[PDB]
Design an enzyme around this catalytic site. Structure first.
Site, short mmCIF file in Angstrom:
data_model
loop_
_atom_site.label_atom_id
_atom_site.label_comp_id
_atom_site.label_asym_id
_atom_site.label_seq_id
_atom_site.Cartn_x
_atom_site.Cartn_y
_atom_site.Cartn_z
N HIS C 133 0.83 -1.19 0.00
CA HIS C 133 0.00 0.00 0.00
C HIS C 133 0.87 1.25 0.00
O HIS C 133 0.81 2.06 0.93
CB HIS C 133 -0.92 0.00 1.21
CG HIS C 133 -2.09 0.93 1.08
ND1 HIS C 133 -3.25 0.77 1.80
CD2 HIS C 133 -2.29 2.00 0.27
CE1 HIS C 133 -4.12 1.71 1.45
NE2 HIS C 133 -3.56 2.46 0.52
N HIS C 135 2.10 4.85 -1.71
CA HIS C 135 1.69 5.99 -2.52
C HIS C 135 3.01 6.55 -2.96
O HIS C 135 3.81 6.96 -2.11
CB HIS C 135 1.00 7.05 -1.68
CG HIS C 135 -0.40 6.71 -1.28
ND1 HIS C 135 -1.50 7.32 -1.84
CD2 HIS C 135 -0.87 5.86 -0.34
CE1 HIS C 135 -2.59 6.87 -1.25
NE2 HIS C 135 -2.24 5.99 -0.34
N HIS C 218 -10.73 3.20 -5.61
CA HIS C 218 -10.69 4.16 -4.53
C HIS C 218 -11.94 5.03 -4.58
O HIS C 218 -12.32 5.50 -5.64
CB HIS C 218 -9.45 5.03 -4.74
CG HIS C 218 -8.94 5.68 -3.50
ND1 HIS C 218 -9.50 6.82 -2.96
CD2 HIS C 218 -7.87 5.39 -2.72
CE1 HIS C 218 -8.80 7.21 -1.91
NE2 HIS C 218 -7.80 6.36 -1.75
N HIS C 245 -10.94 0.34 -1.67
CA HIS C 245 -11.12 1.41 -0.70
C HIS C 245 -12.57 1.75 -1.01
O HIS C 245 -12.85 2.53 -1.92
CB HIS C 245 -10.23 2.62 -0.99
CG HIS C 245 -10.48 3.79 -0.08
ND1 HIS C 245 -9.46 4.57 0.43
CD2 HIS C 245 -11.63 4.33 0.38
CE1 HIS C 245 -9.97 5.53 1.17
NE2 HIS C 245 -11.28 5.42 1.16
N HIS C 271 -7.03 -1.17 4.39
CA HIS C 271 -7.43 -0.66 5.71
C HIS C 271 -8.85 -1.04 6.10
O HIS C 271 -9.70 -0.17 6.31
CB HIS C 271 -7.25 0.87 5.77
CG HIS C 271 -7.62 1.58 4.51
ND1 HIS C 271 -8.89 1.51 3.97
CD2 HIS C 271 -6.89 2.32 3.65
CE1 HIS C 271 -8.91 2.18 2.83
NE2 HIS C 271 -7.72 2.68 2.61
N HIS C 319 -7.21 13.36 2.07
CA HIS C 319 -8.28 13.34 1.08
C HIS C 319 -8.81 14.67 0.53
O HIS C 319 -9.87 14.69 -0.11
CB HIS C 319 -9.41 12.46 1.58
CG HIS C 319 -8.98 11.05 1.84
ND1 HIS C 319 -8.48 10.23 0.85
CD2 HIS C 319 -8.91 10.34 2.99
CE1 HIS C 319 -8.12 9.07 1.38
NE2 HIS C 319 -8.36 9.11 2.67
N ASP C 359 0.46 2.62 3.93
CA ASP C 359 -0.43 3.60 3.30
C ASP C 359 0.44 4.86 3.37
O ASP C 359 0.04 5.90 3.88
CB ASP C 359 -1.74 3.78 4.10
CG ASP C 359 -2.83 4.46 3.29
OD1 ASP C 359 -2.60 4.80 2.12
OD2 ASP C 359 -3.94 4.66 3.83
#
Lengths: 100, 101, 566, 566, 566, 100
Positions: C133, C135, C218, C245, C271, C319, C359
């Site tokens: 996970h 990014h 996502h 997600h 998650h 987010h 993450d």
């Protein structure tokens, strides 16, 4: 010591803070990077001391006042964030409007 | 509390079990110290060490791996040997065998 | 002759029956087996065993290993044993007894002139971690992750762009090609995920053909039943994995609708606890299904005193939410629930959650996946005691259950287990050497593809490598061409067939993913529990078989202030 | 429905009529136009617009852009407007309205599964700067320049050698080949200048054929009429540019003789004010000619209280002069004149000087070209008020005039405007994102060829990318092969034909220069003034049409102590 | 006209008869010759000599040099003279008088448009050092070594592994191939050594065929007569060098037995004094033989007050010895003898020891080879006065004798003298520019293959390169492809024939070793003494012809605290 | 200054030591990296002062006591090593069991 990249990165923050701390001592009005470094360093030591995230989110707003920094600086910092190793591991401290 | 501490259970470890051994009296006739390793072919050690080389043929020191026995000049002492295993082929050292045995 | 056990441990490390404490935690492991022949251990140094004709043979390179890790204490999902590890051609050759067959008994790992030596006596050796996970917000994450002990990174992104800030999607052919090229520069194995949020199959197929090994659905890009079904259809035909997600907003439906859209098809739920994203407040109920491979992100592991206070603002920034917009903050207390956070820890201890991940920089800490997994194990032993599966007076089973979470399971989930994930013959030699006192915190040596890629290094100008300052520095395995030869870029079977590697002129070794669709909950090593779990819509309480699942927040944790400068 | 203007600006950035302050200066810009359709703006984040079937379409990669910069406030020589920017294939695709044609009106920039997103709402987006006076004294200059917002660097040198310390000449075929190879390692577009100081044409032709895109005539290598004529003859036949640093000593003649040697042929005059080099004390009169493209180096921009005090010693070190040798110091007060320094600022405001550059580490500061250009604009507004061309109550025209100085004009001058220099469709996507409060000082994002190459980055191990310490770190666009694919090495048409790129095995994308001979003063965007300027031989006073041109020295400047730690 | 000598030295540097102090030592050199024509010296800068038609000619690139180092004071084993140095094609073109044949007399080094200039007036120029005892424990060593003035590194290793910690062996084909590939990334010339400790020839041949230029026999891998003979047999047939670290333990025999095994065959004995390894306590007697090329490692150079105190623990860590194991510490006082340490210094001054090296991070300091060599020269002048070979009132001969130790001799010993080792026409342009005040301590410029690879650099954003902070930073010669073109990877004749470079896809220039077997003690420049030396088995006293050889421990040394921050 | 890589590396040690020095001042029990940095910095200054290697090998064991550091820390540091420029060049100082 076996310093990891993140530990060495924070040494840059600490050192940047030593600069600001000395200038404030001379009675200068701190600028943008000096203010951020000074307040950030404060929070890291708070974590080392064992203070909680909640306490620091509050105390961090009382390090520098609007009259100790250059004009426009307070508005250039809507918030400050820094992570440190608390007794219960790494945590994020977000201080909103640190300079009033 | 000690980070990474061991909790070794008490007792002893028997080394090189089930293998032929023999004791030999060795004397350092040289003027300089000589140190022999655990897995060195004893029969080919420094020529200054006087002993029955014939008996030590295909043997090594019966000591824990990685250790050694030192012989100061003129020193005399009895050591215990343990036979080589595997293919029982000796290659190297002083080049006196270079093959099986 | 005879040697006492204590002196023996001081020389060659612990043996059968001896126990070792993991860092400063309460977890103790016990050596289950020892593959050596007492008195025949190999040791290196002045006047030691590994010398010509003695512990070293006369065989040619083809008949001996390239690297041998002597007297290692292996900790893997399959056992906690003492043995020598042989490495040949960048892959694990054997786990056994090293030496010279000419004079030593039971030698299975031959040492010759072509053999390098790493002294592992008194150290713990493990497989490199695998974080699924990531990014790709910045390239600096690879070094941070490598230093912590993670040798493979799966995720997506294009750099510090909004899309990558929130998601792990490497949008389209161009960015995928660009990131695949950029990957040759990183000292970790890499596999990319594309944007799977589309209701037109061809848009997904292009991405898979471009090189991605998975697709992420996502909610920020719209996690609708239509998109979910579309991604899973393509995944099923191209043998790639889907990471989810879900719809926290319950905009298109509740968790049961998402599950309905999945239709019993294999999928990795990110998650699963929900703090990092997922149907509020019951996305955690997903771990009860056979087709779901559930993982946790690290900020909620383990439940501590400062966990909640920290999340409120972390969520917003990640987010791109607005703290002034009521609706943007309203779903804060809906996504951050003390109830599920506390339960997640227990579900891990029970084997309900099978993976742990970071993450990275989007509600996760890249260098703390291993560290936090062990902190959970510690807190669970402290609060719940020994597992029903434990045997003897040790935490061996709990250690195998937890190490599998960031090693073999992430590998099985993404179809790369045939290449990495564990210390097994034939697999790439991605190993990490740990000193018992720094286990899970700071590695002694990090090996990639059979070459040390990073390790602590002291004064470069010193007479020895031990003088201060000692900090992590890149090694030969992380240099130019040697790096390419020691790392793997995972491609989709389609990309490999299309000749993507040759077209993009990739320099690293290529590996292909397979078996992503066939894996199920029951395949997760030591973490296959499918509990009858429920979540109360009002109180958020988590229950398994009616019993309440919960835990207490830690005030102080091990592997924290005793090791870090900041 | 309806939304107030203030709330609207807080969400999507300013719109038509709203004004924005540039950093802490007195310059205000006003949004001239907005290409959006109110209520249809695209936004990214949890529960936002850019999601499958909504703001994102079902089109294939070929039918949508790779990157979209949403709600950007564009500041370019052609306008100050609000729009979405589409990037495809590493080039600017369109400036318009992004979204999904399936449900949204007026979409010109389609967003699909293959589209990455950069949120630019509330930010100012500009083209990357172009510095045409670089001394390659050290490779570290590229990063320093990139961080400031300059994406293309033109100049020459071989490293810290005496020749490069004083000049921008990459002497001969061998060094040219070496520097072209070394350029693949730098994250900026690059073009080299050779040594044009020779009276034998073939010596110049070889260099052009070797790969240089221009030749510099520098007095340190002898700026004689013979050399000048020679360089211009070859330039005329090979379509490359000539940069001049005239004879300060008046050794071969005065400014009128140099002008005579030039013979109305196109030429770029470096640091036309003279402090950095040129006929003492009237080299500034060159800006009156149609064939002259005049630029300034940054240490004299703008005229401040400490300008003079600093120059005396800076000059010596750069040109290897001896402070003990009377003749070497005598031409100090002859080269450093308060009179011309003050006038230069005004001539810029009037459009007499068309470019600004650095003159990196040789009487110039590589990271301060953009910063100082704006400081001049500020000081000029303060001292002279609105320009005769201003319309409305803003400084829009002055902003377009000044931004052109370090963007489109440097590009036109060196024949690379077809590739870079402005935000126009078809040009390479070299963009810089700025937060209004840090405009011209510290960039939020620096994009090269469609990939972020450098940006501020916080704690790599943090849960989000925002935590301190935040400082500039290299991104994927600056990594190995991705870098090669996102940067351009400019060659001369001859070098390209000769196959230099294939022979030296250059890995980056190649671009060719053209149109260097045809450009003239009138082509300089917003800076085409040819004033009737004179300089008094005795007093050094500068006059235009008889009127005295001068300005006052600033004691304090914006974009200074409020932003820098040191 | 006429100019005073002092003013002349201030302008062009010292001339015939002038003396210069080396750093802060007591060593003085005197210019023996000057190749210039008074009044015709070339100088660069504003209004200087090197300008079109004047000091610069009209010749094409093929007829002039690429780089010229003006007014340099050369210090090499062959002379201490003043001259201009011409560099062409990355190699030393000529040592003579530079300029323009059109108007100047006696020009042997033509300057044209294609010529770059490095101002060396007032500086000392030397060949790059060559360290033949490198442990590749970490890649960071190359930069450290390059900064000190060493441009070639010979040794072996695979990184921070036990084997490399103690030895310089790159074990087998796989690691050799890996390190050869990794070498392209390092800015120094490199040649690898394989593990020569085997009694089966084919195991050695494979390694040589794999690419190594030598084999090391190390006691840690078993330095038995059988292994020694085996390595020397293969060396004799493949024309590669053997480096020895004999049996300190006297396990297989004494020094006379090892010498017997060598059988008069050429061999390089590492750290011949013994502290770093070798038959206790008389390995030093090896320097008396014609086939032995003896070198010293730096921690024992020179004998100071803290030398002994430091060694006890340094030894342990390096060779993986156990301070608790009596036998492991017993051979401490046997390996560390004040007697031999003191004698070693004198034997160097007499020419009995011919080389100096580091033994990087394994009882040696990588950045102090040059520094310590000069400290020995200083201490020897102080204690013993002028050498019997000195002429005039200078230390010229002593300077030539000592500089040869880390330049030409290491090159002759490893069969690479045809490529590097001295400032002679045809050799690679690896040069180091020193300011007299920092000679041997901190270089002004380090040139590799004709390009500056590293040099001190100030503020990147400054108006000149001189402002603080000034520290060493990588230059263009150390960048990607330019680096490959300016460095050499030395291969064995066999490897070159086998096409190893093409198979491993090496990018750097390739050089082949030859003449390793034919060199003998008498070939060592200025260090060919074969003394009748003896060592007392009991007292450890060293005697030559019966006379006692010894020296006093220094309390303070030059090139120490006056130059270093830490 | 012409700082070499080794001089710049030691600045990291010095700075790491400034952190520890301040925390000890607040009366905190130092952790592993803080202890190593503090004792190492001490030795470097000893060398700068001209103290001998032998003296420092002794004095280095009296910088921090078992009661000034966190539990387990003394056992995590069986020794400390650091090199510095003494009046007679660079030398290695090895301090065994520095914390008692």
């Amino acid at each position: 010591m076996e310093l990891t990249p993140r530990e060495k990165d924070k040494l840059l923050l600490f050192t940047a803070a030593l600069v600001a701390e000395r200038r404030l001592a001379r009675g200068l009005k701190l600028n943008y990077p000096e203010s951020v470094a000074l307040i950030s360093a404060f929070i890291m030591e708070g974590a080392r001391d064992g203070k909680s995230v909640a306490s620091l989110m509050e105390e961090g707003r009382h390090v520098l006042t609007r009259e100790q920094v250059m004009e426009g600086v307070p508005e250039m910092i809507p918030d400050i964030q820094v992570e440190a190793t608390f007794p219960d591991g790494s945590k994020l401290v977000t201080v909103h409007n640190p300079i009033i | 509390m000690i980070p990474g501490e061991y909790h070794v259970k008490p007792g002893q470890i028997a080394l090189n079990t089930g293998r032929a051994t023999c004791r030999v009296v060795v004397e350092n006739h040289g003027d300089r110290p000589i140190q022999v390793g655990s897995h060195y072919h004893f029969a080919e050690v420094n020529p200054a060490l006087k002993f029955d080389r014939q008996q030590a043929a295909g043997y090594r020191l019966n000591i824990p791996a990685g250790t050694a026995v030192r012989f100061e000049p003129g020193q005399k002492r009895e050591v215990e040997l343990v036979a080589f295993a595997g293919h029982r082929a000796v290659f190297g050292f002083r080049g006196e065998v270079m093959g099986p045995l | 002759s005879n040697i006492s056990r204590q002196a023996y441990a001081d020389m060659f490390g612990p043996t059968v029956g001896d126990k070792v404490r993991l860092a400063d935690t309460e977890l103790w492991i016990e050596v289950e087996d020892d593959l050596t022949t007492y008195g025949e251990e190999v040791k290196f140094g002045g006047g030691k065993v590994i010398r010509d004709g003695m512990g070293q043979g006369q065989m040619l390179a083809a008949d001996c290993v390239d690297l041998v890790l002597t007297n290692a204490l292996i900790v893997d999902h399959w056992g906690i044993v003492k043995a020598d590890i042989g490495v040949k051609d960048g892959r694990i050759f054997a786990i056994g007894k090293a030496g010279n067959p000419d004079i030593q008994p039971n030698v299975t790992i031959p040492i010759g002139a072509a053999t390098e030596v790493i002294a592992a006596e008194g150290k713990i050796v493990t497989a490199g971690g695998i974080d699924t996970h990531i990014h790709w917000i910045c390239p600096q994450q690879a070094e941070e992750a490598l230093v912590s002990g993670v040798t493979t990174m799966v995720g997506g992104g294009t750099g510090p762009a909004a899309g990558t800030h929130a998601t792990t999607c490497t949008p389209g052919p161009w960015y995928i090609s660009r990131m695949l090229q950029a990957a040759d520069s990183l000292p970790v194995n890499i596999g990319l995920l594309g944007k799977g949020n589309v209701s037109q199959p061809d848009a997904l197929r292009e991405q898979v053909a471009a090189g991605v090994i998975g697709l992420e659905i996502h909610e920020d890009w719209g996690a609708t039943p239509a998109a979910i079904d579309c991604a899973l259809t393509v995944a099923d035909e191209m043998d790639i994995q889907v990471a989810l997600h879900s719809d926290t907003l319950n905009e298109s439906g509740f968790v049961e609708d998402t599950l309905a859209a999945i239709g019993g098809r294999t999928i990795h739920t990110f998650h699963t606890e929900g703090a990092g994203g997922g149907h509020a407040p019951d996305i955690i109920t997903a771990c009860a299904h056979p087709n779901i491979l559930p993982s946790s992100t690290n900020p909620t592991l383990p439940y501590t005193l400062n966990t909640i206070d920290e999340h409120l603002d972390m969520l917003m920034v990640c987010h791109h939410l607005d703290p002034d917009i009521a609706e943007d903050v309203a779903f804060a207390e809906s996504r951050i629930r003390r109830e599920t956070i506390a339960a997640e820890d227990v579900l891990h201890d029970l084997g309900a959650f099978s993976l742990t991940s970071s993450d990275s920089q989007a509600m996760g800490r890249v260098g703390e996946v291993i560290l936090r997994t062990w902190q959970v194990a510690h807190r669970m032993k402290v609060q719940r005691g020994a597992l029903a599966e434990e045997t003897g007076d040790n935490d061996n089973f709990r250690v195998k259950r937890y190490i599998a979470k960031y090693t073999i399971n992430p590998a099985l989930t993404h179809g790369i287990a045939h290449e990495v994930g564990s210390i097994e013959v034939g697999k790439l030699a991605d190993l990490v050497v740990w000193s018992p006192a720094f286990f899970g915190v700071k590695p002694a040596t990090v090996i990639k593809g059979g070459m040390i890629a990073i390790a602590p290094m002291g004064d470069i100008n010193a007479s020895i490598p031990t003088p201060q300052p000692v900090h992590y520095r890149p090694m030969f395995g992380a240099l130019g061409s040697a790096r390419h030869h020691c790392r793997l870029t995972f491609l989709s079977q389609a990309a490999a067939a299309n000749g993507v590697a040759e077209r993009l002129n990739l320099r690293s070794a290529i590996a292909v993913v397979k078996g992503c669709r066939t894996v199920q909950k029951a395949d997760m090593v030591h973490n296959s529990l499918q509990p009858n779990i429920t979540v109360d819509a009002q109180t958020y309480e988590v229950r398994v078989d009616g019993e309440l699942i919960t835990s207490e927040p830690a005030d102080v944790l091990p592997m924290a202030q005793r090791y870090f400068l900041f």
